[PDB]
Amino acid sequence: GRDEAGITGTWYNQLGSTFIVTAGADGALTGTYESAVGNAESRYVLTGRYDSAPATDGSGTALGWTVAWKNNYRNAHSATTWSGQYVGGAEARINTQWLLTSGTTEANAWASTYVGHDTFTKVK
Amino acid sequence: GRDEAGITGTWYNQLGSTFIVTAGADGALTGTYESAVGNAESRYVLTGRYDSAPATDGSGTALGWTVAWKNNYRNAHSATTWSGQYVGGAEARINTQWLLTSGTTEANAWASTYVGHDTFTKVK
Amino acid sequence: GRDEAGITGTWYNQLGSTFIVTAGADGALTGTYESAVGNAESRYVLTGRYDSAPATDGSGTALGWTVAWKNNYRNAHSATTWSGQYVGGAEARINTQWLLTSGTTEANAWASTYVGHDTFTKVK
Amino acid sequence: GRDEAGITGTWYNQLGSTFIVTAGADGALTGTYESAVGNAESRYVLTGRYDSAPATDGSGTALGWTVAWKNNYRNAHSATTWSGQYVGGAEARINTQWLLTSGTTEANAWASTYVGHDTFTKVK
């Protein structure tokens, strides 16, 4: 993948969360997520996909991934998906927007989903 | 997984798209997605996660998945993530909201991401 | 306004909420919103804007509006904005997506904002 | 309004856009918006609402507003709604997420709506 090397490794967001990812030659994203906030402790499994053959016109590299907030420690009955783009270079970034859906009753389903935005960098 | 059997199989959304998914005992989602709309043809790899031990209080089952819109036929330099919940029973549903991010230049990054909502059923 | 007559009046969404709106010749939306759900009772002031000169090519009419969830009965320290389009005809609809932001501390700001989708019709 | 004085005035976002707003004692927002980006030129009318009696616990002030992208110069057949919170103090901010809906045909309605985030400050 063009950005396999660029994407693979450890990222930090503005909240102090840790995203550890391996990008596969085939478009796979695999790794672990550790949230600094919310009903979460330690690492959670993540999986996702990225564009392994992006445009060569200076566009970013589209990608996304999912965490279900269940591990051996806690279950927050929720899942977050991050949708965004990898921008390479000296200050590489992954700029994302995310949706967090909780399991709810039908009565509360209107309030099931949060939306936010996270920016990941290789330092901090 | 409590809804492993309920989630695994073929789903159809309101657009006529086809979502074919296997839920793993461990929270994994693996399969293929075929979009009826947009810059897409044939099947794309998807991966995601679901809550394999949901609440027993009648709440839905949180889940999410990603497609990168690259296959052997086309590359739309984009990725969609669906975030939502599985609601079991006679008329099982997956109710989602999604983010579609395109790879963009810095100049166009403000316009990178669409948001929408898809409802998947086992028929149609 | 091209859809001034079409938009002006009483609308109902899938939750049983009531949206009473007047569209001005100049693009203004003014009225009241009554939510069937959440921390809400009776009517709240709404204001917004619509495209008073839409495309003639069968496209819908872009529009949006805001409710701050404060009235003489309650204050939910939150505001919802609906963004969407009016689609005219026998079964007229306003198809929206919405963002609900709560006032939060800096610590909880990552969880400030819900996202959802409401469809309004002239009946039910 | 508790933050009537804090909110009223000229704001700038990260894109270089200009938001000029008056907050009314009653919860009204009225003003003009000038976008640095997209299919836009000069000022557009905006209207919205804010929580005129926010919590006294250090929480921000919920607010939202709408622009329909029609003025005497251009019509982009679209509307943006910003939903967010005002955070007072030495470096006052309005932290928003936004939905931009275009008028579309029914065929293209799945792609009608962009989502993004803007942060407004009193300088730059």
UniProtKB/Swiss-Prot annotation, chains A, B, C, D:
GO terms for molecular function: biotin binding. The keyword Signal applies. Its main location: secreted. It is found in: Secreted. Residues 4-124 form the Avidin-like domain. A motif (Cell attachment site) lies at residues 49-51. Keywords: Biotin, Secreted, Signal. It comes from the Bacteria. Biotin binds at residues 33, 44, 82, 98, 110. GO terms for cellular component: extracellular region. Belongs to the avidin/streptavidin family. Homotetramer. The biological function of streptavidin is not known. Forms a strong non-covalent specific complex with biotin (one molecule of biotin per subunit of streptavidin). This is Streptavidin. It comes from Streptomyces avidinii. The lineage of its organism: Bacteria, Bacillati, Actinomycetota, Actinomycetes, Kitasatosporales. The chain holds residues 38 to 158 of 183 of the full protein.
